[PDB]
């Protein structure tokens, strides 16, 4: 889910960067640090929106560094259990179906999908089709899903979705 949240961080700065331009260096270091990063508690951060406040930089005794506490508005993405989201299909396989929701790629097993949608490896595009062959779920398709599970690995979140619930089908 797209959101706009204020977050807090503290970053050390070497004495070389004091210079005639200092606030800009802390700004860009914050950007290079938490741009594209990911956390399991606040979800993935798409980007940092605007830097609100730059606290007083405290010189650590015994160390030349200075730590600046920064408050910044950034937009996060957090998937949820029971949430319904439209996704884009990317791969069809006999083990399951892979669809990308923004930066995450979620896999749906045939067990969770209703039994109507058959496997069809003989088709030129690997695709899922029913007895009537009316609905067609193949690569690059746009399909609705319900996110049931979330898992974080190496601070990177990967979700799992279901197509069983009613009205969840091809767009």
């Amino acid at each position: 889910m797209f959101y706009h949240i204020s977050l807090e961080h503290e970053i050390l700065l070497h004495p070389r960067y004091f210079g005639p331009n200092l606030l800009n260096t802390v700004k860009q270091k914050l950007f290079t640090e938490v741009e594209g990063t990911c956390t399991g508690k606040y979800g993935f951060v798409i980007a940092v929106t605007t830097i609100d406040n730059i606290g007083a930089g405290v010189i650590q005794p015994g160390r030349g560094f200075v730590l600046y506490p920064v408050k910044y508005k950034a937009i996060v993405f957090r998937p949820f259990k029971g949430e319904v989201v439209d996704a884009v299909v990317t791969q069809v396989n006999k083990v399951g179906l892979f669809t990308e929701i923004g930066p995450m790629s979620c896999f749906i097993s045939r067990h969770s999908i209703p039994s109507e949608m058959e496997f069809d490896p003989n088709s030129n595009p690997p695709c899922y089709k029913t007895m009537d062959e009316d609905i067609v779920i193949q690569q690059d398709d746009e399909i609705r899903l319900k996110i049931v599970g979330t898992r974080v690995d190496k601070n990177d979140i990967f979700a799992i979705g279901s197509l069983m619930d009613d009205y969840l089908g091809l767009v």
């Binding site: 070497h14 004495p15 070389r16 004091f18 007083a56 010189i59 005794p61 030349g64």
Partner: protein, 82 residues
């Protein structure tokens, strides 16, 4: 605390001078820009003392009060005695 009325002494204490000079000397030793001109000085302590005499050390002393508040003094705002 009202910065318009700071109750602490306008003088730099001997301990403030000691720690400010040491801190700034470490900063210079770690390739921080120097605020004063330099004839041939290469020792960070000498450069830090020259900056203090010139009143050009970019450090703020946060003096804590017993009640918990604090007062921020620029090194250029304090009276350097020694």
């Amino acid at each position: 605390q009202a910065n318009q009325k700071r109750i602490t002494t306008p003088y730099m204490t001997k301990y403030e001078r000691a720690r400010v000079l040491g801190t700034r000397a470490l900063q210079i030793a770690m390739c921080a820009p120097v605020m004063v001109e330099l004839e041939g000085e290469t020792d960070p302590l000498l450069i830090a003392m020259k900056e203090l005499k010139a009143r050009k050390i970019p450090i703020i002393i946060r003096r804590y009060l017993p009640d918990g508040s604090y007062e921020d003094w620029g090194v250029d705002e304090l009276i350097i005695s020694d």
